[PDB]
Write a protein that binds this ligand. Structure first.
Ligand code: A1JH7
Ligand code: MN
Ligand code: MN
Lengths: 137, 137
């Protein structure tokens, strides 16, 4: 039986800027670094950055919607978004759905998100206003 | 301040086979479907499957090392891996370079993993068998 997400691994083209982005800009804790990767944590999340020469710096129009959302409190959301904006971090989408969301890109074009709200919150909103074809289980 | 992973969203090319893979084959809990997506959970993980016409079925040699690992106990690991193998689930990696792991592909080629152990356990193992150049903070 699967019990949760064990780790997220992102392939990166250049280890130093990726470590700077996740550790210094985003505030994640750096636990270890080696010649070809790093381990960070963000709350319960175990993040691995893996140096990979196959990683392309990928414009957002050229990647699909796969993306990784980090939790933040509503109270902290706006100042963290403003931090990313000051740093010149690119946005790939505007929010049009429930709960605050900020859609931003990492140095290699990985699609990230800041989101406020849980699955329970989303399901409650969907029960009240179901998407087209929505069925609950 | 970021606090963990709020959700993982995977772009999928065909919604129904992907729902079946995550729910029936991997045993995740299905909460809702709609014409363009589904919401599942795996322990505390919120997984969204998002139907995306841009998603390509991608062989593992054409994608980078970005991957998603799910936690499983030592007691359940081998039989779950063997069941995926017997069901014909494609793989993408064989060498255990990060401990007890099984590397397998979803229907669109998303790179998945079963892994036994926490970040703390991995760091302890790495102290004895470190990756080249490893430093611990
Ligand atoms: C489109 C088709 N008529 C259909 C089949 C099964 C469904 O629900 C069960 C499956 C697991 C989500 C559904 F909601 C719609
Ligand atoms: Mn999202
Ligand atoms: Mn892994």
């Amino acid at each position: 039986m699967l019990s949760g997400l064990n780790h997220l691994t992102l392939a990166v083209s250049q280890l130093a800027p990726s470590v700077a982005f996740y550790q210094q800009l985003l505030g994640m804790t750096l636990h270890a670094r080696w010649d070809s990767g790093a381990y960070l944590s963000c709350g319960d999340l175990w993040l691995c950055l893996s140096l990979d020469p196959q990683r392309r710096v990928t414009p957002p129009e050229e990647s699909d919607y796969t993306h990784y959302a980090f939790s933040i409190s509503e109270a902290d959301f706006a100042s963290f978004a403003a931090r990313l904006e000051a740093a010149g971090v690119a946005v790939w989408k505007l929010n049009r759905s429930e709960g605050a969301s900020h859609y931003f890109l990492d140095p290699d074009g990985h699609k990230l998100e800041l989101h406020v709200g849980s699955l329970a919150q989303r399901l409650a909103a969907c029960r009240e206003q179901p998407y087209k074809g929505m069925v609950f289980f």
